[PDB]
């Protein structure tokens, strides 16, 4: 039944899009690229359950707003976030508030763990389901 995994990434930079998909290149990965953040919502708006893993880049400005739309529509998926740091300083509130509590974080220079992260993000999404999409 697993057949293939559906993953939709949101990235305005092709290099980032190729790097994110590069890691998630498994023959069972269906990567969808969204030129905007609103375009990403339209894709999930009809595949929330069909999506197996969402990729996001915190480097975006209103990106938090786009993620809130997914939570707002009720679209919750094992989403992996990029552009995250381990800085404990409050200057950069980089918490899970970007998306639901199941979201996983990936290092910007660590583009390659997406697949292992996707498998982990999937298990994390089920154990945390129903996840809390505070948005």
**What is the set of domains in the chain, with CATH numbers?**
1-135 (3.40.50.2300)
Rounded-to-integer distance, Cα 89 and Cα 51, Å: 34
Contact 67, 40 (CB under 8 A): no
Residue with the two structure tokens 């199941």: 102
Q: What angle do CA 83, 68, 131 make, to 5 degrees?
A: 90
Rounded-to-integer distance, Cα 97 and Cα 23, Å: 25
Q: 3-state DSSP helix/strand/coil percent for the chain, to nearest 5?
A: 35, 20, 45
Method: NMR
3-state per-residue secondary structure call for 61-111: CCHHHHHHHHHHHCCCCCEEEECCCCCCCCCCCCCHHHCCCCCEEECHHHC
| φ, ψ dihedrals at 35, nearest 5° | -60, -30
């Amino acid at each position: 039944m697993l057949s293939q995994i559906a993953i939709c990434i949101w990235v305005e930079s092709t290099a980032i899009l190729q790097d994110c998909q590069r890691a998630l290149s498994a023959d069972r990965y269906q990567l969808q690229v969204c030129e905007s953040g609103e375009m990403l919502l339209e894709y999930a708006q009809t595949h929330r359950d069909q999506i197996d893993c969402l990729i996001l880049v915190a480097a975006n400005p209103s990106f938090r707003a786009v993620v809130q739309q997914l939570c707002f529509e009720g679209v919750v998926v094992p989403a992996i976030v990029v552009g995250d740091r381990d800085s404990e300083d409050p200057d950069e509130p980089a918490k899970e508030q970007l998306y639901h509590s199941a979201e996983l974080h990936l290092g910007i220079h660590q583009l390659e763990q997406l697949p292992y992260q996707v498998d982990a993000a999937l298990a994390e999404f089920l154990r945390l389901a129903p996840v809390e999409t505070m948005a």
